[PDB]
Each structure stands twice: as C-alpha cells, then as structure tokens.
Amino acid sequence: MNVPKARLLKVAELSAKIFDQNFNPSGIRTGSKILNERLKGPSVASYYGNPDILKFRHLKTLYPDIEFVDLEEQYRLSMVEAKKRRGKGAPKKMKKDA
Amino acid sequence: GNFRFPIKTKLPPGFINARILRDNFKRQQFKENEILVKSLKFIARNMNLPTKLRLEAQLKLNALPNYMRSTQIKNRCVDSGHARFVLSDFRLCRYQFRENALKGNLPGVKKGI
Amino acid sequence: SRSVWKGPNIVPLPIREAMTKGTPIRTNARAATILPQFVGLKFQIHNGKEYVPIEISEDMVGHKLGEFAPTRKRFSYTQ
Amino acid sequence: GNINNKLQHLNNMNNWNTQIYNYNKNMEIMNTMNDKLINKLLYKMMTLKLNNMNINKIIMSKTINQHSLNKLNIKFYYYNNDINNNNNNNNNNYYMNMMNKLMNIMNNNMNNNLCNILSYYY
RNA sequence: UUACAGACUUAAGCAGUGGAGCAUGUUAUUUAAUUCGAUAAUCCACGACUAACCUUACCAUAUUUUGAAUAUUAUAAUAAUU
C-alpha cells in the first residue's frame, strides 16, 4: 500500500509483456473478452447426432445379394392401399402451373 | 425440390419433426456464421475504434437472418422433440429420461435412494 | 435500458427517400431508436395488426418507435 | 462370495445396454445416441425375404454395447426358426441360407462389412 | 341391517392460512390473438426445471406447394463395372 503506484504500474506493464497479456491501464472497453471466448459452434451443431448414419435405403446397394424388408414402411403402404379401396384416399394435389 | 430453409442442410439421424428441423437448421447456421458474428460484435464493442465503424458493425449485426442467432437455439428432446424440461445430461425430456432410465439405456443411471 | 456506451439501436431504414420525397416510412422495427435525424419525418409503425401513422418531434428522440404504437386495446368489463 | 465370484452374480455393468465411461461427457452422450440408432437399424435388418411367400423374421434382442478404451463390441442375442430347409439331410452344407448371409456381412464380408461402416460412425 | 374392532376424526402443542402490499396460478371479462390443457377429494409455482426473439402450440401481413420420408419412372452431372 505504501509502494508508489508508479512502481507498481511499471511491474504490471513489464509482467504483462513477458506473459503476452493485454495491458490496458486506462480501463477502456476493448472487446478483448469477445476475442477470447471459445467457439461453441461444433458442440451446438452436433446436438441431434451425427447425420452420416447408415440408413435402410442404403442397404439395397451395399448388400445387393440380400433382400431386406422394412416392416414399418410396408405397414404404411398397406394402410394407403386400404384407404384407397374405401374411397378415403388423399385428394390429388394441385399443380402450381394451374 | 423446395427445401423449406434458405440453405441446404442434412437431416438429423433420429426422430424428426418440424420443430426439430427448424431448431437443427438454426444450429448448423450458427456454427457457419459464429466467427462472423463475433468479429462484428468485436468491432461494435471496441471503444478504440471510431464511432462510425462501430455503428456500421451494429447495423450489419441487426441485418443478419434469425437463423444465425445463438439465443434462438433451444434444447429439445432428441427422442420426442418436446422442448420443456429437457435434461442436458441426456438431451431428453423428463418423461423420456424416465423411460430410458428404467430400460437401462442411459449409461450409468439407476434408481435413487 | 440499452447501455449508453453501446450507442443507439440502429436499424436499416429508408430515410433518404423520406427526406427527399416526404414519403412515410412503413416499418416493423419497433425496437428502432428514434435518432435526431428522424425529427420531422413521418413513420408508419406496425402494432401487430395495423400501421400507426406518427410524426416525430424533438421530444421523441432517444425513445423507440414501438413506444408510440400501442399493441393492446383498453380493457372494459361487461358491467 | 456371491458378488465376489463371476459365476454367481450378474455384474452391475450388464444392467445398462451402453457400457461406457468417457471423460468427455459430450462424446458419451453422442455414443449413447449412436447406440440407440444402430439398435433401431439392426431391428430393420432382421426381416429377410427369399421370395414373395418366403419371409424369414429373425427375432433380435436389444444390443449390448461394450465400450472399452480401444474398441466397441456390439453383442446381441438372436433367434431364427429355420423353416425353409428343416431336414435331416446335409443340403445346408452346400448353400448359404438368408440368415447366414445376413450374419456374414457383420464381420466377414471383405468389402462392405457393417463393422467398417460403423467404425467410421464411432 | 346387528355387534365388535380398526382407523378416520377430535384434543393438546408450534407456526401459519383467512386481513395489507407485492409475486404467481386460475376464473371471469376483454382482445386481431389474449394458444391449449388440468380444473372436488385426486386443478389452481399444475403440465412449465426459466414465454423479450426463439420457445409457440395463438393473431395480422407476406410467402412456399411431392414439402422431412419411401418407392416407381424419366432426365441429366459423376465414378466404377463391363
């Protein structure tokens, strides 16, 4: 506390120089914090998982010899045909050209 | 042929719904533009630069699309898409957390004391 | 209350045309800060449904456009 | 005695379908998410068809994903009722039934084994 | 419908609720919209472990039309096979 401020400022400046630190004696807002924050993009953008997963549609070309059946897809197609037979099918979609 | 978002994005590998697609798109574009937003924010908040350059950066920041905003990213359940009471340790909503926990799907989760 | 050191909340607006032609500026930027240049110009400010016509005076500088376009109707009970 | 012998108790690690510990919690969440997705995919690879009227459904249990420091082992139990050639002959020694073809792409296929595809995913 | 037993209750005790201001939920009413439940015990800081944008499910305006999926059939650009 009795150490003159000039002496303590000389130590701060030299120390900052040796340790590659930003010396801002005035205290002006410099934005250095923004320049030092970490990039969270990679972590944020992987939230929902890796998109390059093997999918059932790729199995018919990876393994031509084997014939796989998608029961979930097959069930949906059967429900579509059933509704067509009862007359409860879907209306034909209007064309933008019209 | 007509993707709903301005830029082409790959689909998440698991459960999909409209809200998940919207959130995922914002996540990908935040990563592509994160550096740009930080650089403009620096120029706009650096008091050593002239006010004119600072105001130019602020104007550019206000003109960026909403899908580049970090504050618009919302954690959703990766299994159901529900966006309330989502545990970040598993990225699942409370109900899906309980169901997965009891099935032994969460690596080290057991029932409490 | 935006920190004064950050400056005004400047938004892209067509002020040059409104200063050389006198046309009203229709805008949805309710957050925009009324800058001292805007004084005298005519603005049409969205309130969620309609665009409220408002002319800017010298006592409006510093405030924001949204402050002059109320978004709700006055409450009334079926007494 | 019971818990101090490997033959008299079930290791608690087996109570979980994903057996993993990563210091990087994010990578652990990713591995857990990858294990559910692969489990779903494998369920879709169990139904096979030789002809329109010969659909063989293999019943698969949930996968046990053993994550060690160097490798991931995906262990699962499966049941298949061989209804196409359930004879007393040795004709099955001269062709690969659909279930053998499916099991041989997991590790044996030299060009497109599922392990190599998953090795890049993980 | 009988008897007994059990609690249920009551008592005692401590601090509160019910009164003031504010926070919050609900109702009612209003509103272009005031999203939707739950709504005696067993709803009412409940769903919701955080509504400025997002969230969002509502309203106004503008805009998109095989759309996020699978398959079929064409067309191309590309790499292998032959």
Next chain:
RNA sequence: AAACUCCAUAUAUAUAAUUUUAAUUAUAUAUAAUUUUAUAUUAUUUAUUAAUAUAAAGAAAGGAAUUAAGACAAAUCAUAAUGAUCCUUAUAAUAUGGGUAAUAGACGUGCUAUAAUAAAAUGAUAAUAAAAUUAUAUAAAAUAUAUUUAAUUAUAUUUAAUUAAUAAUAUAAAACAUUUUAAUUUUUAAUAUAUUUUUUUAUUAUAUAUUAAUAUGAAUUAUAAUCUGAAAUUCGAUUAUAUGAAA
C-alpha cells in the same frame, strides 16, 4: 407377501511412498441386532408364559425399494406412438411484428411486513458446515469508477489457477460480543453534584398534534448509469439519487 436385502450406524482387514491431505479422510470387502441375560413383582390358558420394574452386556437408536387384486370407462391423443374420421394452394411449411404479461370482481399458493424474548450497523494472524458445480466453463488476486483514508456493495479492466480429493464458484449464516434503536419527558442539553463516573442526583429547557405509521415498513414513481443479447418499446435483471403507499 413378509422377508432376504441395500442404505445409515459401529467395528475389522486391504489400499494411500499422509504434498490431489480431509488419515478427524477416501472406498472396496467382511462382521453386527428382529438385541441378549438374569432377578423381583403382577396377571394368565400358571407354563418350557406374558405385562412391568430391576441389575448386567452392547455403538445399536433410523430408513429405504418394490408390488396382489379391483374401482373411479379418474388425467394424458400437448412427452412420444395407434385405429377411425377430417384438411391437402392448406387445418401443411417459412419470415416479420404482435399476443401468451390485457384488467371490474372472485379464488388458490407464496414472499415481505405491521419494532425492543428484535431489528440495524461493526467484528482480519479471519468462530463454526454439508452437499453440489466448472470443455456449449467456474473465474482468483490486483487495478479503475460509483467514492470518501480504507473497508463494504455494484460494475468495468485484466483472465491467475483448475477441466478438478489439487484450482475456482466460496472467509457459510444465524450464533456470540459491542454500539444503536421511533413510540418513550423511559430522551437530550445547560449548570451544579457524587465513593454508580460508559454513571447518579438536583434545578431549568427539551412540543404540538396524536389512535396513532417512526430512525418501523418498502409498495408506487422520477432521473441517471450498468448487465445479457443482434435486439430489453409492448416485456428482463442490477445499481445510485430522490420518492416513501397500505399495513
């Protein structure tokens, strides 16, 4: 089903070159109780018994989880999933702004307060915790401003250490001691006085109003500044000066 059990607790062994130190600890294994024993008394279905007391031994005193059936066709189609039915240029999809925060009355649940067995300051060789958190971070010390010697509080500047039994969030708080405290003339002051002296006594002055709101209370509101964010107008948080409602 009970239990067995797991947890807690007590003890033993093992592990730690006791500077990742908390060895007064950490966490693996095992042990222990559903306590036991005698003695007198009182009842009994009197016997190889209960209810009590008494002495003796012991650390021994607490919890957990899960379901068996059935009812409310109780809640949920808004965690996700299914049938039927309806929309398919729209009841699907995207953007900007707005709303979900409106306000007569009513209700539920909370917070703060209405003063003296109770509130406010101050307490640096730093009284005394536990359980958590920190790679989509936790942020030390220091310096600057508010702001005054300093401290305290808030923010800025800067970004030490630690991705952790190591460093940080973080010197726990109440407690306890001293001082102060409206209503209260139960006070304060001027003289004199004392073997109560941080005090006693005496004589003067110390208000009036007043069932009442103060140095209680902190709602409401003005102005300035700050924090997060691209953005704080509808509609966020904090600080300073001023305001000071009901109770």
